[PDB]
Paper text:
Phospholipase C gamma (PLCγ) enzymes have long been recognized as key components in intracellular signal transmission, linking activation of several types of cell-surface receptors, such as receptors tyrosine kinases (RTKs) and immune cell receptors, to downstream processes triggered by the PLC-generated second messengers, diacylglycerol (DAG) and inositol(1,4,5)trisphosphate (IP3). Mutated variants of the two PLCγ enzymes, PLCγ1 and PLCγ2, have been linked to specific cancers (including T-cell lymphoma and angiosarcoma), resistance to cancer treatment (e.g. CCL resistance to ibrutinib), complex, dominantly inherited immune disorders (originally designated as PLAID and APLAID) and inflammation as well as with protection in Alzheimer’s and related neurodegenerative diseases; the major, comprehensive discoveries are described in. The current model for activation of PLCγ isozymes, following cell stimulation, outlines a shift of equilibria from an autoinhibited, inactive enzyme towards an active form, resulting from a large-scale conformational change and characterised by a release of autoinhibition and exposure of the membrane interaction surfaces. The area in PLCγ1 highlighted as a likely nucleotide binding site, using HDX-MS and additional experimental approaches, overlaps with one of the two autoinhibitory interfaces, an interface formed by interactions between the TIM barrel in the PLC-core and the sPH domain from the regulatory (γSA) region.
Residue numbers in the entry: 19 to 190, 207 to 233, 245 to 524, 545 to 768, 791 to 934, 947 to 1215
Write the structure that this text describes.
């Protein structure tokens, strides 16, 4: 303790260290770093006084000594930026799979050691701070993000804009102390509705609270008043009011109801139970990762050492290595036949050794998919033995055993899963006869990234292409005049003067602007000069700013006043010292902002009906085409856009200085549209193509290969190199150039020139969207599939001169569809020749040695071909294992075969992994595999979908040690996941839940969420069901919900999960994930329980929680 109070102050003051930037463009610079300790943040900026970056300490995952980060590795050949590893350390922090990294370099060794021990103590202390102190640091954090820290107070409009940033909409000056009391009074006021039968500020005593924990919460220990007293003081952590008998204010009780100290999840179950770790390994569910090296999708994402660290530190116990021959005798790890980056086998092994047992004592299994040559396999084996040492399992635990060893017997051991040689042989036995080629990226002629021209904006975008022996699958696309005070020309006469006075008047009255607030415009009367307007005593004042180009140098001046070299210098001067105009003395104060910059934008039409907008946008064959139209009522607009081949509209309202869309508020139409070019507005669609007349006239015209054009007029050749033709003639093989002249073939003459405005280009059908209602759902691209080409019906030609700034282009055409063609670009000449050659070959078709040194390391986890007939017999070997891609496993976890699979899994390991078509790294449902006793159910840990949320829920029992004992009831001969009658007299469970409110729900975009909660039980099919509440309007900070009691009945509570998902109902009646919590049903507490909420990666959201009334029968 005393050491910690001395250590915090040290880092409070801070240090200077150079910072290696994750962005590729940026190069290392120095800043200065400190810990606020009242917000528990790390801050840094330029010099000793500013703020330029921040890190929440509650988000820190790992503080890592050394220079091991990709930020450091970017400059590791640059002699200027090759530091010494002792001088460095890395903070890995965040709430997604890919952590953020602060990669810092301090000179002394002991600055690093102090920071590591400092941040480490704070890291733990912040994570376990009791809820009032966490709420305290949150309020501090919101306050220090506005005009506070300078005048110590904040505006009532700066307070409005802050509450909307934390999901609260006020229907219509203060310091931090009044700010906190405001928040406290607001949360209690908003949710005083809740049924809460056990219930201004009133006081509840030590007696009252103890009575609560016993009659309503089932906390039997609370018959001891002293424990209840130590509980309340453990909540408040107020040193004051501790000598006196503890109490809760009435709003303090409601905050306790929402807090993690009141979680429905019994934290006693976060501990490992060693008593349950004595069955054979086959009896356990084992946390398992698929292609662990990958950070994103299966085709182009980066392989990272950090993913092994992250997965291991999430409690995963089975990880995967795809090993290929590497450049220097040492294997690289990457996903074969794809563009995922390569990492080295030695760096992977040191990462595994480093992090294997940080999160758990229990054994790690390395599943190795091996394509290496024998020699490099041999270096693998030598490296395993040398680096892992006695960590490596290298001989059986028990040579007389008839079952796998227990997790306890394998603690701190790492096991190797690899093909094992037949004893005395040099090939592995391969009794696997599946020439059903899977049709994935593993079994294809060529895979790669190629570029397709957008027909609306004519940019090139990347797409995943896969050529099989019959088809090509291509995917969806992958991965002074600027001055606020210068309003330019507002009109030609009195209208311009009236426009300035309206802008200035409205801005001043609406915002309570100060005197001196001003704008500048081009003079309506004195050509070349400007007029200045500023507010003084509720009246507008106008002043001429003269402009003279005598002596060839710009001279600007107000009448009878000083001379300046630019408009900007004049305005900047008079913002500091007063001007004298209309005989007043005034200083120039606030620039009035322009509210009408949308008027000159491509996407804006002052006069457009809804039908006209639909007609324009239906001509754009891509989603995300859009415009804004003014409407017939004042202060009213609409956005019109294309999504899924349909047209949508939504109203935009101007209210003074802001604009409103749904409940999302913006400064202006321009800032609105600018926001939805960067963030999605409908589903995943951003606004991409602004439609006006010019954009419509330019759609599709990228055609280059045997293009026909229709003659609009008769043309008689005025020269010998010129084409003669009649109106409506079809001119073929047209070479298109700018300058108004094209080349083409007509009436016997070849490649003769004609005026390009005398013809229209024939539509290229390839520019239209492919009909996706009958696309193969299981092509090698999975759900990323956009279009299929039937290769023998195509032909391909290189265009040597390239196209449109792409140098390497070929053209896919179909002889039997005139005018159809795709220009397809590659990144290199070699990549171009390889595609053309392999595609043409496909068109003209109408039709494993293993190194002993490595085989020796496979003790258990020995892959064999799956032998269904060996199950239940003396032939079955507990050391052998088999593997099932998702679709094969689906054939053994159904009503017919599931019991057989359960019998296999009691003795032997089975591994499940996703189907290769899931190129998007999505995940299959793990529960059907688990409920038949499969142990190694490999999911993509990088993907934040429901299967990974179930995985982390399941392994939450045991604190993510990664091994959960399967319940004995389902290692019974009788158990049948598709027949609840085999459960015999296993007692069921009835859960009744009322969702009372929520606090601190996260935002999804700029608006205010309208949240509902879906409550789900997941388990056997006979137990799985969903229910949901209504949604409430415009409140994510403290909503409450109508009375709507839910009932669930669970015949098998030993395999059942309770799941809460908070969704928003958005402005389009779409449902969007906001937060979730999933729990095994066995560890549920009853009464009025908080549901602490997590994000889609299962990482704890700050303060976000539900309050529920949950009652479970039969009573404990």
């Amino acid at each position: 303790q005393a050491e910690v109070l001395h250590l915090c102050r040290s880092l409070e003051v801070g240090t200077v260290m150079t910072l290696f930037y994750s962005k590729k463009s940026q190069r290392p610079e120095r800043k200065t770093f400190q810990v606020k300790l009242e917000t528990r943040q790390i801050t840094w900026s330029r010099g000793a006084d500013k703020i330029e970056g921040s890190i929440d300490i509650r988000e820190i995952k790992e503080i890592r000594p050394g220079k091991t980060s990709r930020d450091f590795d970017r400059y590791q050949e640059d002699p200027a930026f090759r530091p010494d590893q002792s001088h460095c350390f890395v903070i890995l922090y965040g709430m997604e799979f890919r952590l953020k990294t602060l990669s810092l370099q301090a000179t002394s060794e002991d600055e690093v050691n102090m920071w590591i021990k400092g941040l480490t103590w704070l890291m733990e202390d912040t994570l376990q701070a009791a809820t009032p102190l966490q709420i305290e640091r949150w309020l501090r954090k919101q306050f220090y993000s506005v005009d506070r820290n300078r005048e110590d107070r904040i505006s009532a409009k700066d307070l409005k804009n802050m509450l909307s940033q934390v999901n609260y909409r006020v229907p219509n000056d203060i310091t931090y102390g009044q700010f906190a009391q405001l928040y406290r009074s607001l949360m209690y006021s908003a949710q005083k509705t809740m049924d809460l039968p056990f219930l201004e500020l009133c006081q509840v005593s030590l007696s009252e609270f103890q009575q609560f924990l016993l009659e309503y919460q089932g906390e039997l220990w609370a018959v001891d008043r002293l424990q209840v007293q130590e509980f309340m003081l453990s909540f408040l952590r107020d040193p004051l009011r501790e000598i006196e008998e503890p109490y809760f204010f009435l709003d303090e009780l409601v905050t306790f109801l929402f807090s993690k100290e009141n979680s429905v999840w019994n934290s006693q179950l976060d501990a490992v139970c060693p008593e349950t770790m004595n069955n054979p390994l086959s009896h356990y569910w084992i946390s398992s990762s698929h292609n662990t090296y990958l950070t994103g999708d299966q085709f182009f994402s980066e392989s990272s050492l950090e993913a092994y660290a992250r997965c291991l530190r999430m409690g995963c116990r089975c990880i995967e290595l795809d090993c290929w021959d590497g450049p220097d005798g040492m294997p690289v790890i990457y996903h074969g036949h794809t563009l995922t980056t390569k990492i080295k086998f030695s760096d992977v092994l040191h990462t595994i050794k480093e992090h294997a047992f940080v999160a758990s004592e229990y054994p790690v299994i390395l599943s190795i998919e091996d394509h290496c040559s024998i020699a490099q396999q041999r270096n693998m084996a030598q490296h395993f033995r040398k680096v892992l040492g006695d960590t490596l399992l290298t001989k059986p635990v028990d040579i007389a055993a008839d079952g796998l060893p227990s997790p306890n017997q394998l603690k701190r051991k790492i096991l190797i899963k690899h093909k094992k040689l037949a004893e005395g042989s040099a090939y592995e036995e391969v009794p696997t006869s599946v020439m059903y080629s899977e049709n994935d990226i593993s079994n294809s002629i060529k895979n790669g990234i190629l570029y397709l021209e957008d027909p609306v904006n004519h940019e090139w975008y990347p797409h995943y292409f896969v050529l099989t022996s019959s088809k090509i699958y291509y995917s969806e696309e992958t991965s002074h005049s600027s001055e606020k005070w210068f309003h330019g020309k507002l009109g030609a006469g009195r209208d311009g003067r009236h426009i300035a006075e309206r802008l200035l008047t409205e801005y001043c009255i609406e915002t309570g602007a100060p005197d001196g607030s001003f704008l500048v415009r081009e003079s309506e009367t004195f050509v070349g000069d400007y007029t200045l307007s500023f507010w003084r005593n509720g009246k507008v004042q106008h002043c001429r700013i003269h402009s003279r180009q005598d002596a060839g140098t710009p001279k600007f001046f107000l009448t009878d006043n000083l001379v300046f070299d630019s408009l900007y210098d004049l305005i900047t001067h008079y913002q500091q010292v007063p001007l004298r105009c209309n005989e007043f003395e005034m200083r120039l104060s606030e620039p009035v902002p322009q509210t009408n910059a949308h008027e000159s934008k491509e996407w804006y039409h002052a006069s457009l009906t809804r039908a006209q907008a639909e007609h324009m946008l239906m001509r754009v064959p891509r989603d995300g085409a859009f415009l804004v139209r003014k409407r017939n009522e004042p202060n009213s607009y609409a956005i019109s856009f294309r999504a899924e081949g349909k047209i949508k509209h939504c109203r935009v309202q101007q209210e003074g200085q802001t604009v409103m869309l749904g409940n999302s508020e913006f400064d202006s139409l321009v800032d609105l549209i600018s926001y939805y070019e960067k963030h999605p507005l409908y589903r995943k669609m951003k606004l991409r193509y602004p439609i006006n007349e010019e954009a419509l006239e330019k759609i599709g015209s990228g055609s280059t290969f045997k293009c026909a054009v229709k003659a609009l007029f008769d043309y008689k050749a005025q020269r010998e190199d010129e084409l003669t033709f009649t109106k409506s003639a079809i001119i073929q093989n047209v070479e298109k150039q700018d300058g108004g002249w094209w080349r083409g073939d007509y009436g016997g003459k070849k490649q003769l020139w004609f005026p390009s405005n005398y013809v229209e280009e024939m539509i290229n059908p390839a520019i239209l969207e492919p009909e996706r209602e009958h696309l193969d759902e299981n092509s090698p691209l999975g759900d990323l599939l956009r279009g299929v080409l039937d290769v023998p019906a195509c032909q391909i030609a290189i265009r040597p001169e390239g196209k449109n700034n792409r140098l390497f282009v070929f053209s896919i055409s179909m002889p039997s569809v005139a005018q159809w063609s795709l220009d397809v670009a590659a990144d290199s000449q070699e990549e171009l020749q390889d595609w053309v050659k392999k595609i043409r070959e496909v068109a003209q078709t109408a039709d494993k040695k293993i190194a002993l040194e490595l085989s020796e390391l496979v003790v258990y986890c020995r892959p064999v071909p799956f032998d269904e007939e060996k199950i239940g017999t003396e032939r079955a070997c507990y050391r052998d294992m088999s593997s099932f891609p998702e679709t094969k496993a689906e054939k053994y976890v159904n009503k017919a075969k599931g019991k057989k699979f359960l019998q296999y899994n009691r003795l032997q390991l089975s591994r499940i992994y996703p189907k290769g078509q899931r190129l998007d790294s999505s995940n299959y449902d793990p529960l059907p595999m688990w409920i038949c006793g499969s142990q190694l159910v490999a999911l993509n840990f990088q993907t934040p979908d429901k299967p990974m949320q179930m995985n982390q829920a399941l392994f939450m029992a045991g604190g993510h040690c990664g091994y959960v004992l399967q319940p004995s009831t389902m290692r019974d001969e009788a158990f049948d996941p598709f027949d609840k009658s085999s459960l015999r007299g296993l007692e069921p469970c009835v859960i009744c839940i009322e969702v009372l409110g929520a606090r601190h729900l996260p935002k999804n975009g700029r608006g205010i969420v309208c949240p509902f909660v879906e409550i789900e039980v997941a388990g056997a099919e006979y137990d799985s069901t969903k229910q949901k509440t209504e949604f409430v309007v415009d409140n994510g900070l403290n909503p409450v919900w109508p009375a709507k009691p839910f009932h669930f009945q669970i015949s098998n509570p030993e395999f059942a999960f309770l799941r809460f998902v908070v969704y928003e109902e958005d402005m389009f009646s779409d449902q969007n994930f906001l937060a979730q919590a999933t729990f095994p049903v066995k560890g549920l507490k009853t009464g009025y329980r908080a549901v602490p909420l997590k994000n889609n990666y299962s990482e704890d959201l700050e303060l976000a929680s539900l309050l529920i009334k949950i009652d479970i029968f039969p009573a404990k």
